[PDB]
Paper text:
DAXX (death-domain associated protein-6) is a histone H3.3 chaperone that functions with the co-chaperone ATRX (ATP-dependent chromatin remodeller α-thalassaemia X-linked mental retardation protein) to assemble repressive heterochromatin at GC-rich repetitive elements, such as telomeres, pericentromeric regions and endogenous retrotransposons. BNRF1 is an EBV-encoded tegument protein that is essential for transcription of viral genes during the earliest stages of viral infection.
On the basis of earlier findings by our groups and others revealing the structure of the ternary complex of the HBD of chaperone DAXX bound to the histone H3.3-H4 dimer, and biochemical evidence for quaternary complex formation between this ternary complex and the DID of BNRF1, we had successfully reconstituted and crystallized the quaternary complex of the BNRF1 DID (fragment 381–599) with the chaperone DAXX HBD and H3.3-H4 dimer. The structure of the quaternary complex shows that the BNRF1 DID folds into a globular α/β domain and is positioned on top of the DAXX HBD—H3.3-H4 complex with X-ray structural statistics listed in Table 1 and a portion of the electron density map shown in Supplementary Fig. 1a. A DALI search involving the fold of the BNRF1 DID alone based on the quaternary complex revealed that the overall fold is highly similar to the structure of the B-lobe of the first PurM-like domain of the Salmonella typhimurium FGARAT (StFGARAT or StPurL) protein23, with an r.m.s.d. of 2.1 Å. It is also apparent that there are extensive local differences spread throughout the entire BNRF1 DID fold, especially in that the BNRF1 DID has an unique and extremely long loop (L12 loop connecting β6 and β7), which is important for binding to DAXX HBD—H3.3-H4 (see below). The DAXX HBD—H3.3-H4 portion of the structure of the quaternary BNRF1 DID—DAXX HBD—H3.3-H4 complex, is similar to our previous structure of the ternary DAXX HBD—H3.3-H4 complex, with small local differences in the binding interface for BNRF1 DID and with a small r.m.s.d. of 0.7 Å.
Author numbering:
A (entry chain A): 37 to 135
B (entry chain C): 182 to 386
C (entry chain D): 383 to 400, 413 to 480, 488 to 581
D (entry chain B): 26 to 102
The structure:
């Protein structure tokens, strides 16, 4: 239990959200461009808040890890077997919905 | 103490980075701004990283070791067998550092047969595997909702922050409710047919 | 009272003890508050709520919160209730027995602590001193948070810091609020 | 046409407690990702233009996320 730091000028929950955001896996240009692809897709042309791209990324990876969590949570094996859409569809069959 | 005078300039610099991070978080982007590698979004991410490592500099500057307030950090203790030193080896799944510490069934079985072997338990592969399955699903779930929890804790920014659940506009204007029931229909339809798409596709094997 | 906006991450405090008897304690809480506005004159209270009254504690706590919910600690409960702990959600039931039904002479406040030590005092500390001098008991129960309605964390083992109450903590024994 | 990293996906997978994966699972996650975003934005925009606005808001996206079933469950009560 070594010492810990709380700064005076910044609320922690802000610093924890910033550190949370720097943690995201996918690179942010690829993402930004995938939202472009879906917007130019939808024929809707609206400016997006950058705050809203933020929300979309945080939530997307939430969902994806959520699906791998779901798929590994039903794996009973004799040794490691590599994971296939068989397995994801079975995991989803058992639990479902989101993450 | 003339140095203690300098450390607060670093702290308010932190305050400044957060000022500009919110100024960028508000800036709105059309589509061509969304192809931009220099866009207000990516600027906001460059700023967030420069902040967090200023913070880290500063943490290692006060001896205080770098970490901040997350449920990820606390080791999650587990005694779910009736056998406490199986839970010795098992309880440090987590002792492995940071995120990405999360097992599959194989790992739990290796740790339960580790604590079976070197502690010399000697119980059949039967109830050994009951212990391994019960435990794996139990801590799988506990860990999952611990992560989810950390998500609803720190999510979005000061903009998403102010959200009441019952000012949802769909409530007073049922035309909107109509449209949204429609979109959710579409959404679930698609999810399930894409998952089954790659199922019945990988059947090509 | 001066007000400031309600955002997540403030502190929840309760001012009071644990006509007639309720008339004495009253004179103290409102006294301490005044003293506070004097001792620390910068507008940090977001969400004072008494109303309507007299009403069951959790209902008092209901009108305190516009968004999200609260997370409070078992060590920072009043020693009268804290003592009845020394067994899972079995104890959720008891802490409901003490903090749900009983009707309060107490005042619940949410104060925001933002930098800016005044004189010697912090927010929590100027409320500490103004409270003691005013002859008034005060418990800092926990902090205001995005998740859940009412969330208790098991604090009994190690206490939380006066200051370290804003961290994440993952509760057991979660309690939904009331209706209107 | 360039995608998103085969390692980044092997890394989301690894985060889910998954070691290695069938090849085609790579592109499955791509597909799944894109479906998700679609019907979040679809819902977000539905708000945005109902309220008659030229910009999609981080609030619009919260209102959409919480509508996605379990996804944001627990937030803001």
């Amino acid at each position: 239990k070594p010492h810990r730091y709380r700064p005076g000028t910044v609320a922690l929950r802000e610093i924890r959200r910033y550190q949370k955001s720097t943690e995201l896996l996918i690179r942010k240009l690829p993402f930004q461009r995938l939202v472009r692809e879906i917007a130019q897709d939808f024929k809707t042309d609206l400016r997006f808040q950058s705050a809203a791209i933020g929300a979309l990324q945080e939530a997307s990876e939430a969902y994806l890890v959520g699906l791998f969590e779901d798929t590994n949570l039903c794996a009973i094996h004799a040794k490691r077997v590599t994971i296939m859409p068989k397995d994801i569809q079975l995991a989803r069959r058992i639990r479902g919905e989101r993450a | 103490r003339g140095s203690r005078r300098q450390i607060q300039r670093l702290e308010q610099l932190l305050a400044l980075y957060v000022a500009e991070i919110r100024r960028l978080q508000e800036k709105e982007l059309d589509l061509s701004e969304l192809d931009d590698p220099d866009s207000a979004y990516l600027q906001e991410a460059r700023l967030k990283r420069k902040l967090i490592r200023l913070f880290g500099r500063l943490c290692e500057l006060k001896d205080c070791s770098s970490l901040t307030g997350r449920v990820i950090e606390q080791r999650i203790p587990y005694r779910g067998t009736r056998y406490p030193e199986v839970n010795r080896r098992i309880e440090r799944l987590i002792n492995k550092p940071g995120p990405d510490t999360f097992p599959d069934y194989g790992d739990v079985l290796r740790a339960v047969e580790k604590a079976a072997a070197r502690h010399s338990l000697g119980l059949p592969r039967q109830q050994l595997q009951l212990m391994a399955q019960d435990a794996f699903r139990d801590v799988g779930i506990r860990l999952q909702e611990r992560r989810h929890l950390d998500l609803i804790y720190n999510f979005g920014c000061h903009l998403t922050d102010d959200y009441r659940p019952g000012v949802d506009p769909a409530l007073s204007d049922p035309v909107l409710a109509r449209r949204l029931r429609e979109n959710r229909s579409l959404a679930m339809s698609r999810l399930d047919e894409v998952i089954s798409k790659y199922a019945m596709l990988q059947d090509k094997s | 009272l001066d007000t400031v906006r309600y955002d997540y991450g403030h502190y929840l405090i309760m001012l009071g003890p644990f006509y007639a008897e309720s008339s004495w304690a009253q004179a103290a809480v409102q006294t301490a508050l005044e003293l506070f506005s004097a001792l620390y004159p910068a507008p940090c209270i977001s969400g004072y709520a008494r109303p309507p009254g007299p009403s069951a504690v959790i209902e008092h706590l209901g009108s305190l919160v516009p968004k999200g919910g609260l997370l409070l600690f078992l060590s920072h409960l009043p020693d009268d209730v804290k003592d009845g702990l020394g067994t899972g959600p079995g104890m959720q039931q008891f802490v409901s027995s003490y903090f749900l039904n009983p009707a309060c002479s107490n005042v619940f406040i949410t104060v925001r602590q933002r930098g800016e030590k005044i004189n010697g005092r912090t927010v929590l500390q100027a409320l500490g001193r103004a409270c003691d001098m005013a002859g008034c008991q005060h418990y800092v129960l926990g902090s205001t948070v995005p998740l859940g309605g009412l969330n208790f964390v098991n604090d009994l083992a190690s206490p939380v810091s006066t200051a370290e109450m804003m961290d994440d903590f993952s509760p057991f024994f979660t309690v939904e609020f009331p209706p209107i | 046409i360039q995608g998103i990293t085969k390692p980044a996906i092997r890394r989301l997978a690894r985060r889910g407690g998954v070691k290695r994966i069938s090849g085609l699972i790579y592109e499955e996650t791509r597909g799944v990702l894109k479906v998700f975003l679609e019907n979040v934005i679809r819902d977000a925009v539905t708000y945005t233009e109902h309220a008659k606005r030229k910009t999609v808001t981080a609030m619009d996206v919260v209102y959409a996320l919480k509508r996605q079933g379990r996804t944001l469950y627990g937030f803001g009560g």
